[PDB]
Amino acid sequence: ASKLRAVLEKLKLSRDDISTAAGMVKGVVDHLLLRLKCDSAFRGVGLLNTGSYYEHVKISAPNEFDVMFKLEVPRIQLEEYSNTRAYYFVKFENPLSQFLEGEILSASKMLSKFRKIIKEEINDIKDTDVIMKRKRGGSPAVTLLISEKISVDITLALESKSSWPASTQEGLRIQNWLSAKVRKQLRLKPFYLVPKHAKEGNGFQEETWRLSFSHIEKEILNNHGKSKTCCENKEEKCCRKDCLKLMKYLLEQLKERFKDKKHLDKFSSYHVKTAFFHVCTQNPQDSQWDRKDLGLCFDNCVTYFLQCLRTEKLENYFIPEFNLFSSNLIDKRSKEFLTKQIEYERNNEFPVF
Numbered sequence: 588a589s590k591l592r593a594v595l596e597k598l599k600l601s602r603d604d605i606s607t608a609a610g611m612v613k614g615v616v617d618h619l620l621l622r623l624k625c626d627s628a629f630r631g632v633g634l635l636n637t638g639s640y641y642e643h644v645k646i647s648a649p650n651e652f653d654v655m656f657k658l659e660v661p662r663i664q665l666e667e668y669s670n671t672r673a674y675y676f677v678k679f680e681n682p683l684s685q686f687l688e689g690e691i692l693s694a695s696k697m698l699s700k701f702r703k704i705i706k707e708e709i710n711d712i713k714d715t716d717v718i719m720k721r722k723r724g725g726s727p728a729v730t731l732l733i734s735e736k737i738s739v740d741i742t743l744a745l746e747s748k749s750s751w752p753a754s755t756q757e758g759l760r761i762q763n764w765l766s767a768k769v770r771k772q773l774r775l776k777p778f779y780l781v782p783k784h785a786k787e788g789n790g791f792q793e794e795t796w797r798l799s800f801s802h803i804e805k806e807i808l809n810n811h812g813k814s815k816t817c818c819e820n821k822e823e824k825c826c827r828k829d830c831l832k833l834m835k836y837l838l839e840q841l842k843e844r845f846k847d848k849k850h851l852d853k854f855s856s857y858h859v860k861t862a863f864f865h866v867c868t869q870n871p872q873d874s875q876w877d878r879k880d881l882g883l884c885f886d887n888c889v890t891y892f893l894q895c896l897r898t899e900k901l902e903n904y905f906i907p908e909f910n911l912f913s914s915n916l917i918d919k920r921s922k923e924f925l926t927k928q929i930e931y932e933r934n935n936e937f938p939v940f
C-alpha cells in the first residue's frame with residue numbers, strides 16, 4: 588500500500604514548515620483573551636481544556652488554524668428547537684443580560700460584541716500585522732489573517748458543566764471499543780454550544796445553538812485504542828489516525844477539483860470524522876487497524892462512507908437521531924454525485940492522491 592504511505596509522508600513533512608506560524612497564532616490569541624477578559628460579560632472566557640491553542644480542520648492547508656473560545660454559563664436551561672435534536676434555544680441580574688432577546692440568549696448579539704471587541708483590538712495589535720477578514724457570508728466565527736500567510740478562525744462557544752442533553756442518552760457507543768468505564772468518564776466532561784451557521788439548512792436567522800463535542804472527539808483520537816498502550820511503542824503502531832487523515836484529504840481534494848461547481852459545498856471534515864468514528868466502533872480491535880493493512884482499513888473507511896451516501900444515513904456520533912445525511916440537509920443529487928466521484932476514485936487507486 589505504498590501510495591497511501593507516500594501521500595501521508597507528504598502531508599506530514601509539510602506540517603512543520605511554519606510552526607513558527609502557530610507561535611504567532613498563540614501570541615495573537617493571548618492578547619485577544621486578555622482584551623476580551625476586560626469586558627464584564629466576557630470575563631469567564633478561555634480556551635478549551637484540549638491541551639492545544641488551535642486545531643487544523645483542513646489538512647490540505649497547514650496555514651489555516653481553528654480556535655475555540657469557551658464561555659461558561661452556570662445553571663443553563665435549554666429548550667430543544669422543534670425536534671432537531673442538536674439545536675437549542677438557551678434560557679436562564681448577571682452581565683449576560685445584555686444579550687437577551689426577550690427570554691433567550693441571542694447568539695447574534697453576543698457575536699456582535701465579540702467581533703467589535705476583537706476588531707478594535709487588532710487595530711492596536713502591535714505584534715505583527717493582523718487584519719480581520721469579513722464574510723460573504725453568514726458564518727459564526729471570526730477570521731484573522733496573520734502576516735498575509737496564516738489564517739485563524741475563532742469560534743465562540745458556551746460551556747455547560749451540567750449533564751449532557753437528553754438527545755445524547757444513546758450516543759457515544761464506544762463500550763465495546765474503549766470501555767463503558769471510559770464512556771462514563773467522558774460524559775462527565777462539559778458540553779458546548781456554538782452558533783449554527785453557513786449554513787443551517789434553515790432560516791436565515793433564528794437564535795438557536797448547536798451542540799459541540801469536539802473536545803470529546805479529540806480525547807478519543809488521542810486515546811483511541813482497545814489497548815491502553817496503542818501507538819505508545821514500536822509493536823502497536825496502528826493506522827487509525829492515518830485513515831482519518833486520508834479520508835479528510837480525499838474529501839478536500841475532491842472539494843478542490845469541483846471548486847466552482849456547487850455540488851460538494853455542503854460536505855465537510857465533520858461528515859468524514861463522523862463516519863470514521865462509526866468505523867472505529869464497528870472495528871474495535873487494534874488488530875483490525877494494523878499498520879500493514881493501511882490499504883484495507885482505508886478501503887473500509889471508504890466503503891463505509893459510500894454506504895452512508897447511498898442510504899442517506901450518517902448518524903451524528905453523539906446524537907443518534909440527528910442524521911447528517913437526511914434529505915432535509917443535503918440533497919440526494921449531491922450525495923449521488925459524491926458517490927460517483929468516490930467510486931471513481933476507489934476504482935482507479937485514488938488519482939487525487
Ligand SMILES: [Zn+2]
Pocket residue numbers: 811812817818823824825826827
Ligand atoms: Zn493506535
